[PDB]
Each structure stands twice: as structure tokens, then as C-alpha cells.
């Protein structure tokens, strides 16, 4: 699996430290091109970095800071797009990569790959024992198009540097090694050519490439500059219809594409929405619409009347820049079944903002969210009310989609709550992102869910520290409901089953349906006890009726 | 805020060449096609193209088959109509507007770059 | 090719009266009409779209209705901003044309 979605945390500290290389080992673990941004930031001294060998592309910028490691090992890296830049200008960004005051700290760049970078510019700054960032030609690297290449670098060292290896032409090293050498793409190029291979005409890039390559073809592309349309190297994506040009009546184009991130596709990945328009998306456009299309699948159609309302959740619509769910926006949600954003529950929300006016959220208040089924953001909970033991107000949750990720990595976190088990006894699918859940002290039930049914791709994971030991719950006498199969559950009790071993009257487990010998005597419909009519007459030790209806009684 | 910015309008000789830019932001550019609306002196709106950003086709008004070409340039958000052997009656403010349901009304339109061709 | 013909060319009504504008296309067009809004100087703004709704944030005395080859527009009082010009399109035939439009303009 080559495409993976990149974090959004920037120099924010991870909260919690002990998962926070693992979090990076899953996420890039096997993964050449990176969809937004690579961060790596936080690395201790030791850290095996080695799942990043792997990365050809980065989307949107890399920042590489706060680490002690000496070296991160990104020697496949080859282009970097900066669909987004940090600080609004590098695409690169290099920073304290020291130690907090043998010794730790970033040493050489190693970016021996890094070709290309097409938007937006190089920031390199406060990292002591860093060597050979003043001696490579940035120029070259920048795209003929990069209208913000520029560098800001520091070359302030605590160490000594060794020359290049005497194999490199100029002084241009990536480091000490003889394998470091920087290749140059641009500056040496015959004509007007954007990229080369070297200095003869003949060894011109294909205008439609983008780090260089290894022939003169649009198939022999390093990298491809828009698309990369099955192999080939193209500036836009197959029309998903061919026209007329006098009647322009349109037949639809069997080798039609959608567009997602920098390749042609023939249907949009797994989490997206294929758009009218050719496009992915997390979001349909204005005057179309969600849609569960004949197959399962998401998909956005137009509306034909004006599309029908829709609950908006944080960051989305009016409530684009709210940071909590508080009084003030609680009954927002009332009656939605499913919410297009996120919900996050923080210590403000919960104790109040004197400040503006804005009560806490009482606990009763969160019933609300009983009716809801989907979010398609995600699920964040840093605080909940401490007379409620478990997140059982989300007890109808079937989905939380994580087509928005909180600091782009996870799409349910909870941490530091005191609730005692989980509760959520609906929760199918999380459809991308990873779980954290952290430092609440007396969190039972966790190892009870079989996370590894929830998820829908290899890169996610549940990330857990802090908790009650599982040891200590048991031991405390605490369990599955014997009616609970392959010994799964997200509680006690008979209704917090994964998946019911015998019938399911209501949401309960029930070891026998009412068949013969109950007080509401009741019929089975695939596993599920369902009553007859009030007026059928109940017979003594037989069936009762065959279904709901008074035509299926016995009298 | 959503908002289109026209440039690149000014004087020409009939004949001539000339190219229009739409610059976009507040939206995501390739979740939308694109379209170009003329507007003569006192006279009213002409439609003239529709550019899609995924595809980099376009839907143009026959009147101008073979003279106006329609291009994006995604990595800027950025429109262009490129008029050639221009004319009197092309002589307009040209908008630059988003086609919304991409059925063919409208929403969101910029202010105008305006054309003038006299000798 | 599809004509859209507005009536009247222009009219001149006083703050608080109703003003209706019709808009005759000359060949079935179901629902596809929107209705624009014009300035002098400024660009325009599209009110109502699918022949009788209302565009987001429109005011609600804009109301579009109709369908087939008759269409109108109705403010059902005039506002001082009001006074403009008022475009329909047909969108539901290639290829897409506007009607020729339609002055309000204040009577005193």
C-alpha cells in the first residue's frame, strides 16, 4: 500500500509521549507517497526511524524539528509538492534539532533524492550538530515554477564538519558519504529544459515530469509533475465523458478518471466522495449532496430540489472556528442522526467561560447526542462529567468516518477521563485515523473491544497508555456478559455485546426469545425477538404466531 | 469569502491577440467548473465557456469555436481565455463566474476585466 | 437557438410596491431558469435558481415561479436597494442564454 495521509500537528507536543513513535511507525510504515504534510517532530535519541525508507513524495510540506536523533532516514525522498507550507512558506523546515541543553541532535540532511520542490521555500535554523545544509545548490532543487523559493539558514554549529567525499564534483554533499553527492537537475540543462539528466539536449526530461529522469519519455518520469495517469505522466485527467463539440450531447468515457491528489483514478479511494465534476473529495460541493449510492459506496449527486439540511459539527460551516461543544451550541445537535464535522468535549466545556457569558454543560445536556448515529469528522473527549461512567450517550454511534483527523493523525481520542468502561455499544467503524486513548485511570473494557474489527486500513491502529491494567480489572472481578461471543464487549452487561451469541430482544442478549412459555409471548425474525399483536390469544407450551400482524395469530 | 479576480483586459487592434486570467480562492478550485460571461456596452449577458479543472475541458458557445480557448492551471487556481483574431462586437467586460450545480447558473461572480477593440 | 424574452424592458415603481417581471422562453425549458440581479458598475448576483428558489441569504420577498415557457419574478415590496437590473437565464438547453433584461427604476 504506497498512499498514506500525513499528520497536521505542527510543533505542538504530542500529548501523549509514550505512543507517539508508534503513532509514526504505523502511519508511514510501508508508504512512498504521503498525502499533506510530514511531520517528524519529538524523536528521543534512539528512535528507529527505519519505516520512513520508504517515502518517495510528500503532498504538502516536511518539518523536521525538536528531535535528537541523528539521523532521520529520508534518502528515497524525491519530490516534495508543498500543497501546503509551514508557516505559509516552507515547504522544508529543518528546527531545534538539538539537545535541551555523543551528544544528540540531527547531523546530516541526507536528503540524497530530494530533486524537486515545487512550491514554497527552505527554512534550516538551530540545529548544532547539523553539517552540509550551506553547501547545497537550493536553487537547482527549487521548481522553474516555485514562486516562493527562498532559503533562511543558520549555520551556527557546536561541531567541527568533514569535507564532502572527495568524489563530489563541487562542494555539494549531503552528508559525509560518497553516496551523498547532490545531483544536479536544473542548472545544467541544455535549453530551455525544466529538468534533466544530464547536460545534453538529448538528455532532456519530458516536459510533463518533474524530478528528472531516466529517458526522454513521459513514461520515464522520476515523478510526475500534475498527474500520473497509470504509468504516464499527464496535465490533466481523462474527461469522464466525451462531447459532440456542435451538439455537445455527451456519451460517458469508459477510460474516465477522477482526480485524487497527484494521479488519475478509476474510482475514488476508499474514505473520499466522487464528484459530478471528476474530482475526490471530503466535502461535496455547493447544491450537491451525500449520497449511499446503489453499491455502499458514498458519492455526491446533485440535488434536484434544494438539498435537504444537514447538522454541521465543529469546523464545519458556522461552526467552522468552534473549539468545544458548550451550552451555547449543545442544542445545535438536537435530533441530528448523523453530524457533518466534529465533536470535541474539553475542560471549558465543562467547566464553564465566565469571560463570555457561557454556562457549563450540565451532564443531562448530553443526551442529546442519543439519537446520533454517524460523525464524519472525528471524536475527541478531554473531559466528561464525572458522575457519568462511560460514553454511553453515544450509544446509537454506528460510524465516525475521520474524514477530518484532530492534528490530522486521530480520529477518536480519549484521554483523562475516569469513566470506567467505554460504552460506545454501537461503534462498527472508524473509517480512517487512529484511536488514542490515554491516561484514564479507570478505564476498564478497553482490551475487550476488538479494535482490529473497526478499522478499515493497515495503517491504523488503537494507541493506549495510562489506563487500568487489564490485570486489575479482572481482578476486581469484572467481565463480559457470559452472552457475549468471542468474549468481546464495550461494557457489562448483556447490551454491550459486540455481537450477540444467542437473540436480540431490544438491544439486549437474551439466552431464549419468548416463544413457549413468556409473558409477551413473541416470534423470531433472524435472530431478534420480535411480540405478535397484543390480541393473540398465547398458548400453552406452542407457537403463539408466525409474525407482528393479527392475520398471523393462532386465534 | 469565496472570491474570482479578472485581469488582463485592455486595448487591441482587431485581429489581434489578447488573454484573459480568473484567479480563485475561498473554495475548492476542483470540486467546481469554471466559466467565462461577456457583456457589451449597454447590451446584455452572453454566455461563452465552461473549463473543467479535473479534465481540462471545456464547454464552449459555438459562436466562438475556433477563436476563444479555455485553460486551467490548478497549482494556481487560475483560469484563462485566450481570444484570438478579435473583433468590434467582442468588445466587453468579461466575467469571470463559477458554475454552481454544474448545471449552468451561476453564483459567484468577479468583478470584470474589460476588452476594447477598436483600431 | 433559444430566445428569452423579458417584459417589461423597464419599469418605474416607488418604494413599497409589488413589481413583477415576466420572462417568456421560447421553447420548453421545465425548470431551468435562474433570475440575476445587476448594478451599474458592479457584477452580478444570482437571486433564484431551478425557476422558484431562493438563492442562500436571498431576502424572502424574491420568489421566482413558473415552469415551461412562462416564467416571472416578484419582489413583493421594493427596497431602496432593490432598484437594479433583473436578468433570467435559461439553463435547462445548450446552449445557455439570458434574457435581454429588465430596469427598476424609482418613480417620484
Known amino acids: 500500500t504506497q498512499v498514506c495521509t500525513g499528520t497536521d500537528m505542527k510543533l505542538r507536543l504530542p500529548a501523549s509521549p509514550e505512543t507517539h513513535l508508534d503513532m509514526l511507525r504505523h502511519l508511514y510504515q510501508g508508504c512512498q507517497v504521503v498525502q499533506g504534510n510530514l511531520e517528524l517532530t519529538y524523536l528521543p535519541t534512539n528512535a528507529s526511524l527505519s519505516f520512513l525508507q520508504d517515502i518517495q513524495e510528500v503532498q504538502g510540506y516536511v518539518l523536521i524539528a525538536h528531535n535528537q536523533v541523528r539521523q532521520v532516514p529520508l534518502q528515497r525522498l524525491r519530490i516534495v509538492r508543498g500543497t501546503q507550507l509551514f508557516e505559509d512558506n516552507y515547504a522544508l523546515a529543518v528546527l531545534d534539532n538539538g539537545d535541551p541543553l555523543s551528544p544528540g541532535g540531527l547531523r546530516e540532511l541526507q536528503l540524497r533524492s530530494l530533486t524537486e520542490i515545487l512550491k514554497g521555500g527552505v527554512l534550516i535554523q538551530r540545529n548544532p550538530q547539523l553539517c552540509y545544509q550551506d553547501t547545497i545548490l537550493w536553487k537547482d532543487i527549487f521548481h522553474k515554477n516555485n514562486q516562493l523559493a527562498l532559503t533562511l539558514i543558520d549555520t551556527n554549529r557546536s561541531r567541527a564538519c568533514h569535507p564532502c567525499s572527495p568524489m563530489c564534483k563541487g562542494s555539494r554533499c549531503w552528508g559525509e558519504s560518497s553516496e551523498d553527492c547532490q545531483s544536479l537537475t536544473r542548472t545544467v540543462c541544455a535549453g530551455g529544459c525544466a529538468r534533466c539528466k544530464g547536460p545534453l539536449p538529448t538528455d532532456c526530461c519530458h516536459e510533463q515530469c518533474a524530478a528528472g529522469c531516466t529517458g526522454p519519455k513521459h513514461s520515464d518520469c522520476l515523478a510526475c509533475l500534475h498527474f500520473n495517469h497509470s504509468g504516464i505522466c499527464e496535465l490533466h485527467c481523462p474527461a469522464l465523458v466525451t462531447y459532440n463539440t456542435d451538439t455537445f450531447e455527451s456519451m460517458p468515457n469508459p477510460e474516465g478518471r477522477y482526480t485524487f491528489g497527484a494521479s488519475c483514478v478509476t474510482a475514488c479511494p476508499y474514505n473520499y466522495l466522487s464528484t459530478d465534476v471528476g474530482s475526490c473529495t471530503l466535502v461535496c460541493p455547493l447544491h450537491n449532496q451525500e449520497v449511499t449510492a446503489e453499491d455502499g459506496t458514498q458519492r455526491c449527486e446533485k440535488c434536484s430540489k434544494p438539498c435537504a439540511r444537514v447538522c454541521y459539527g465543529l469546523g464545519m460551516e458556522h461552526l467552522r472556528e468552534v473549539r468545544a461543544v458548550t451550552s451555547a451550541n449543545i442544542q445545535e445537535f438536537a435530533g441530528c442522526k448523523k453530524i457533518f464535522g466534529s465533536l470535541a468535549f474539553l475542560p471549558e466545556s465543562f467547566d464553564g467561560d465566565p469571560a463570555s457569558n457561557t454556562a457549563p454543560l450540565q451532564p443531562e445536556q448530553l443526551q442529546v447526542f442519543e439519537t446520533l448515529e454517524e460523525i464524519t469528522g472525528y471524536l475527541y473527549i478531554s473531559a466528561w462529567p464525572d458522575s457519568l461512567p462511560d460514553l454511553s450517550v453515544f450509544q446509537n454511534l454506528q460510524v465516525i468516518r475521520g474524514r477530518i483527523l484532530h492534528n490530522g493523525a486521530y480520529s477518536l481520542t480519549l484521554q483523562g477521563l475516569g469513566i470506567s468502561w467505554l460504552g460506545l455499544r454501537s461503534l462498527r467503524e472508524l473509517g480512517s485515523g487512529l484511536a488514542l486513548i490515554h491516561h484514564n485511570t479507570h478505564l476498564c473494557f478497553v482490551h475487550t473491544v476488538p479494535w482490529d474489527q473497526l478499522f478499515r486500513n493497515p495503517h491504523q491502529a488503537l494507541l493506549h497508555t495510562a489506563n487500568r491494567p487489564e490485570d486489575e480489572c479482572v481482578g476486581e472481578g469484572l467481565a463480559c456478559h457470559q452472552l457475549c461471543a468471542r468474549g468481546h464487549c464495550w461494557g457489562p452487561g448483556p447490551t454491550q455485546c459486540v455481537n450477540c451469541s444467542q437473540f436480540l430482544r431490544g438491544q439486549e442478549c437474551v439466552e431464549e426469545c419468548r416463544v413457549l412459555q413468556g409473558l409477551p409471548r413473541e416470534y423470531v425474525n433472524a435472530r431478534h425477538c420480535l411480540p405478535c399483536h397484543p390480541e393473540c390469544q398465547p398458548q400453552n407450551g406452542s407457537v403463539t404466531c408466525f409474525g407482528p400482524e393479527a392475520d398471523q395469530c393462532v386465534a | 469569502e469565496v472570491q474570482l479576480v479578472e485581469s488582463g483586459g485592455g486595448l487591441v487592434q482587431p485581429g489581434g491577440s489578447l488573454r484573459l486570467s480568473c484567479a480563485a480562492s475561498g473554495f475548492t478550485f476542483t470540486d467546481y467548473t469554471m466559466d467565462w460571461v461577456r457583456q457589451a456596452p449597454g447590451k446584455g449577458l452572453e454566455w461563452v465557456a465552461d473549463?473543467?479543472?479535473?479534465?481540462?475541458?471545456?464547454i464552449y458557445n459555438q459562436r466562438f469555436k475556433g477563436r476563444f480557448t479555455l485553460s486551467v492551471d490548478r497549482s494556481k487556481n487560475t483560469l484563462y481565455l485566450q481570444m484570438n483574431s478579435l473583433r468590434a462586437e467582442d468588445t466587453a467586460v468579461y466575467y469571470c463566474?463559477?458554475?454552481?450545480?454544474?448545471?449552468?447558473?451561476?453564483?459567484?461572480w468577479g468583478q470584470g476585466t474589460l476588452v476594447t477593440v477598436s483600431s | 437557438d433559444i430566445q428569452m424574452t423579458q417584459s417589461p424592458s423597464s419599469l418605474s415603481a416607488s418604494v413599497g410596491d409589488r413589481v413583477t417581471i415576466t420572462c417568456k422562453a421560447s421553447?420548453?425549458?421545465?425548470?431551468?431558469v435562474a433570475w440575476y440581479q445587476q448594478k451599474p458598475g458592479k457584477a452580478p448576483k444570482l437571486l433564484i435558481y431551478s425557476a422558484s428558489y431562493r438563492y442562500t441569504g436571498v431576502p424572502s420577498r424574491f420568489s421566482g415561479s413558473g415552469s415551461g415557457t412562462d416564467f416571472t419574478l416578484t419582489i413583493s415590496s421594493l427596497q431602496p436597494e432593490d432598484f437594479a437590473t433583473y436578468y433570467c437565464?435559461?439553463?435547462?438547453?445548450?446552449?445557455?442564454?439570458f434574457g435581454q433584461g429588465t430596469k427598476v427604476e424609482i418613480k417620484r
Open positions: 437565464q435559461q439553463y435547462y438547453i445548450y446552449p445557455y442564454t
Open positions: 463566474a463559477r458554475n454552481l450545480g454544474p448545471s449552468f447558473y451561476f453564483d459567484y
Open positions: 421553447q420548453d425549458v421545465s425548470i431551468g
Open positions: 473549463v473543467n479543472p479535473n479534465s481540462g475541458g471545456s
